[PDB]
Amino acid sequence: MRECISIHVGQAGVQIGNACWELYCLEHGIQPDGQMPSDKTIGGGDDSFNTFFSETGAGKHVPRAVFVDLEPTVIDEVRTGTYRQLFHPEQLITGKEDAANNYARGHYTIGKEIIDLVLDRIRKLADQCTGLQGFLVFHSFGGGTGSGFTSLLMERLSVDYGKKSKLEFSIYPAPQVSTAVVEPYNSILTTHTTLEHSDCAFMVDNEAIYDICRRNLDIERPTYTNLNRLISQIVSSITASLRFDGALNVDLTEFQTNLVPYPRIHFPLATYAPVISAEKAYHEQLSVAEITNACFEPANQMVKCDPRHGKYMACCLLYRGDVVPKDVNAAIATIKTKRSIQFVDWCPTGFKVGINYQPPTVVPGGDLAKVQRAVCMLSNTTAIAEAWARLDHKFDLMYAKRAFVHWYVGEGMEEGEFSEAREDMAALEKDYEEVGVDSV
Amino acid sequence: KLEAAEERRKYQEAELLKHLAEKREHEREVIQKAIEENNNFIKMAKEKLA
Amino acid sequence: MREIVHIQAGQCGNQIGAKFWEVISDEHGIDPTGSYHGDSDLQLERINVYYNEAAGNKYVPRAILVDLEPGTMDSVRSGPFGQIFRPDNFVFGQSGAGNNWAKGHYTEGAELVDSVLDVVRKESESCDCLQGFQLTHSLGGGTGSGMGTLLISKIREEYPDRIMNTFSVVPSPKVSDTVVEPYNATLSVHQLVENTDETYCIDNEALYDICFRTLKLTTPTYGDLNHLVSATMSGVTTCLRFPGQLNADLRKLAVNMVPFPRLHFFMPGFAPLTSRALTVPELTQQMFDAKNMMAACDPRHGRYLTVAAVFRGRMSMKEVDEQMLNVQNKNSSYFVEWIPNNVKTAVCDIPPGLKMSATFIGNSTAIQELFKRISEQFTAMFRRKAFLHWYTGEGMDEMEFTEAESNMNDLVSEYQQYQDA
Ligand SMILES: Nc1nc2c(ncn2[C@@H]2O[C@H](COP(=O)(O)OP(=O)(O)OP(=O)(O)O)[C@@H](O)[C@H]2O)c(=O)[nH]1
Ligand SMILES: Nc1nc2c(ncn2[C@@H]2O[C@H](COP(=O)(O)OP(=O)(O)O)[C@@H](O)[C@H]2O)c(=O)[nH]1
Ligand SMILES: [Ca+2]
Numbered sequence A: 001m002r003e004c005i006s007i008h009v010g011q012a013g014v015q016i017g018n019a020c021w022e023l024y025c026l027e028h029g030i031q032p033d034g035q036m037p038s039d040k041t042i043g044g045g046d047d048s049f050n051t052f053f054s055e056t057g058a059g060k061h062v063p064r065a066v067f068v069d070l071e072p073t074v075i076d077e078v079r080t081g082t083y084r085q086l087f088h089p090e091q092l093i094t095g096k097e098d099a100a101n102n103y104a105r106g107h108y109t110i111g112k113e114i115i116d117l118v119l120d121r122i123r124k125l126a127d128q129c130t131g132l133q134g135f136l137v138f139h140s141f142g143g144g145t146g147s148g149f150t151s152l153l154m155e156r157l158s159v160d161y162g163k164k165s166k167l168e169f170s171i172y173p174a175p176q177v178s179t180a181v182v183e184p185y186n187s188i189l190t191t192h193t194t195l196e197h198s199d200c201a202f203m204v205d206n207e208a209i210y211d212i213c214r215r216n217l218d219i220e221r222p223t224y225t226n227l228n229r230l231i232s233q234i235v236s237s238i239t240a241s242l243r244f245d246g247a248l249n250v251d252l253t254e255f256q257t258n259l260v261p262y263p264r265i266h267f268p269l270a271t272y273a274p275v276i277s278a279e280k281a282y283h284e285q286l287s288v289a290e291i292t293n294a295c296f297e298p299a300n301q302m303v304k305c306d307p308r309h310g311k312y313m314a315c316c317l318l319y320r321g322d323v324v325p326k327d328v329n330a331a332i333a334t335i336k337t338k339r340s341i342q343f344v345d346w347c348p349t350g351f352k353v354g355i356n357y358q359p360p361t362v363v364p365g366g367d368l369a370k371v372q373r374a375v376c377m378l379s380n381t382t383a384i385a386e387a388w389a390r391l392d393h394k395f396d397l398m399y400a401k402r403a404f405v406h407w408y409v410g411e412g413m414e415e416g417e418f419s420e421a422r423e424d425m426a427a428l429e430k431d432y433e434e435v436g437v438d439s440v
Numbered sequence B: 001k002l003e004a005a006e007e008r009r010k011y012q013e014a015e016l017l018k019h020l021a022e023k024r025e026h027e028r029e030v031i032q033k034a035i036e037e038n039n040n041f042i043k044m045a046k047e048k049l050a
Numbered sequence C: 001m002r003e004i005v006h007i008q009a010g011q012c013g014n015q016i017g018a019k020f021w022e023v024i025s026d027e028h029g030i031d032p033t034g035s036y037h038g039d040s041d042l043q044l045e046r047i048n049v050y051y052n053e054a055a056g057n058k059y060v061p062r063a064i065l066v067d068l069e070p071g072t073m074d075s076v077r078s079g080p081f082g083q084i085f086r087p088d089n090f091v092f093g094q095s096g097a098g099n100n101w102a103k104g105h106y107t108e109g110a111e112l113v114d115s116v117l118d119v120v121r122k123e124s125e126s127c128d129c130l131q132g133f134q135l136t137h138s139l140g141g142g143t144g145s146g147m148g149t150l151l152i153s154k155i156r157e158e159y160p161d162r163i164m165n166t167f168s169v170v171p172s173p174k175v176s177d178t179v180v181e182p183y184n185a186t187l188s189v190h191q192l193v194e195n196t197d198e199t200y201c202i203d204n205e206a207l208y209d210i211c212f213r214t215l216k217l218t219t220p221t222y223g224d225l226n227h228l229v230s231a232t233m234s235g236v237t238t239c240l241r242f243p244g245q246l247n248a249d250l251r252k253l254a255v256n257m258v259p260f261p262r263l264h265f266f267m268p269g270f271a272p273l274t275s276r277a278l279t280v281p282e283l284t285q286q287m288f289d290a291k292n293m294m295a296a297c298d299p300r301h302g303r304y305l306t307v308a309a310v311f312r313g314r315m316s317m318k319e320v321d322e323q324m325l326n327v328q329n330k331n332s333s334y335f336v337e338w339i340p341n342n343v344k345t346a347v348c349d350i351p352p353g354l355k356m357s358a359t360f361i362g363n364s365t366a367i368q369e370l371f372k373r374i375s376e377q378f379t380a381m382f383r384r385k386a387f388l389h390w391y392t393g394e395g396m397d398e399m400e401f402t403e404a405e406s407n408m409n410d411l412v413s414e415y416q417q418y419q420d421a
């Protein structure tokens, strides 16, 4: 009861899913074969970890997850890798030909050939749920599958599950690790087509994660493996309230009430601390006040933008580990007297707090220090619109010359879809200005 | 004078139960509006995609 | 006039409800298995007001436990007195109400409400002479607020000649779960104004301030807040539960306390405040002190329409009468002169882990401060239609929010009218 189904789409979605599920197995004491010795109820139950794991009669704990890619090579590494026994083969879905960094191929030409099979496999997971809460969708903005197949899937899920919650984890493109010149086209097309179908979207700027890996973990040239381990810690903080019990534990749905004042304004800024090497953590214990203070440093944000130059509509603190409310409340009081935290005039200023007592876990061979306490701040700030403004500008430079547009038109798209998507983004940028203006 | 009193009590009671009846009518209209908007969303997403 | 049916709805309602039954079971000498092991005939004389008698001289609370999620009722069933409740009186769905009044009142709650009324009817049918109903709930969430006020409307439809009493926990930004609490509270107050006879306003603002300022608790928990609520609830139900002359049933309390039908929102108070020996002068001064009030309203900012004072313990009835007369005579301007003798006093010999205590129930025009505070928080969001999509998604229109706001502003004006008269 209260099951959540995860859907991992395309390379970024799949490799981030690998890192998240590895970490969840370590957090819950689940072995790579699916066995969980601490679980005394064989073949079922309604423990908090059953939101994300189903159970077979043979004691196997199976992710409530589908992995989809339009080419096989990334999902083939899950099929032959360390966690190969965790997943039933029917949860891992591949085509033969990818979307070639083209939204139009992911949504239409290649995507149409596999969408009915993917919905079939998702239906099989939904049918084993006694009270399905909703879906968590992991994808890139920049890839053809991450952009175009995800848009198609989100539209089809609105039809087949009506208003069931759909949450996204969306990888926003950075030039240091980008693979396509057309990523801005793909980003705007998928944001436009998905925006009415998504309840809440957590954007992860590859450039913010890349910089955190370089600056805080002293990684000279971060790989996807480095970025994904850090992303999995942030995802785990957000989903921890669904996967664990505790008196001070606050369900993600209750944070969502505070984070989404209007349906379109559904893009929270995540900030995570502490991100520290084993060599720096040694004999340096970071207190509740230190990790809380670090949530108001822009350098710890998942998206590059400056909240000191916008307005808050919501601030949520999701603590894990050795944290009591007394220390949180003193940390917040100190921060209020010292920082640039300006709320809109129509929103209350209180910070909403959750505490999960289970400390953070790290993956063996990882870059992050094992710490006693961590925090993820989810804020609704007008500053997140900066990320849209950057992408919209790159879109405008190329689109004014119709650069690369023939690749989309060749797959059956019209120019009208480009100008409609871009107009929706202009109206979104404008919505973020309007909600920040003072009431008359 | 006792029957007249009783009839005023029965009148005030029938007035209350009429007002509570309009409330049940309104409750029935809120949930039907919720269903009709969910169905119209699904319908219009289905048609736009086709 | 005899049986009361108790309903507890949602997380808050069930947490304060469970503490109420623990506290009054201990006062009446009832143990967690429902067996009587007390030392006084005073404990059993009016036991039937709150308890049914079962096979083998077992006492079973006349209590119905309601929620749209199972979690808080599983915790009640595991709590100390959890086994005393009738198992068929647990009525719960699986969906929850997401802190949304519209889900409680119109969508999720509507699905569950008929099965709650089946249990109310079963309890009501075996009553020799039902006095009426008391509901414990919060106004800030979805189940207690939205489904609680739906239940009240349906109970009134089926029992229109019976008294409806609520213990209603008013939300505060100081002890807040969501930004939408002021919406849920305004929609609920609109229901309570029309469909209750008596509402005890339990303000989380006041309970927090008492725990912080007076009891020196640096970090108040819901447990600390609920200790104040359960002591107040024991105090204000003493006259219903023990032999006595004054306010001995729900209709007589209403007739003494409610001069105009809409002005039925009471400011409770308690002395002494607790987490060794108090004199009658000290009880009396403390029970009337702003700092001992469970609603964050300054009684010096309004006038008392009516007051009930209940003294508990072995004390001089002469000294209680003298002190109660002293407060009225010395502070005469704060008691409206157009309701003569508007302060009534009861004394019960059985004290609550104290030798003596005083409970205060006031109908003060200062209660408008509580409604104005909720009204200001409502408007700040409603002028930008902020967070409304949570409510329009369940079929509600903006107009329903405009009507609730107007009716609550009208209630404020009416308190102001009698304050100036
Ligand atoms: N953080 C992170 N970003 C990734 C990862 N893999 C790819 N990306 C980013 O995702 C974007 C490219 O999309 P991909 O997910 O590779 O493409 P796809 O969804 O497989 O789409 P096609 O290959 O075109 O069918 C770029 O912005 C990459 O930097 C990954 O494992 N982690
Ligand atoms: N005093 C008190 N207030 C509570 C308690 N639990 C929740 N609240 C308050 O009740 C409101 C939330 O409603 P709640 O009862 O949790 O939601 P429901 O289950 O949907 O009715 C907020 O105003 C909280 O501050 C409690 O045990 N005691
Ligand atoms: Ca199990």
Ligand SMILES: [Ca+2]
Pocket (backbone or CB within 6 Å): C111
């Ligand atoms: Ca249902």
Ligand SMILES: [Mg+2]
Pocket (backbone or CB within 6 Å): A010, A011, A071, A098, A143, A145
């Ligand atoms: Mg690919």
Ligand SMILES: [Mg+2]
Pocket (backbone or CB within 6 Å): C011, C141, C177
């Ligand atoms: Mg709650």
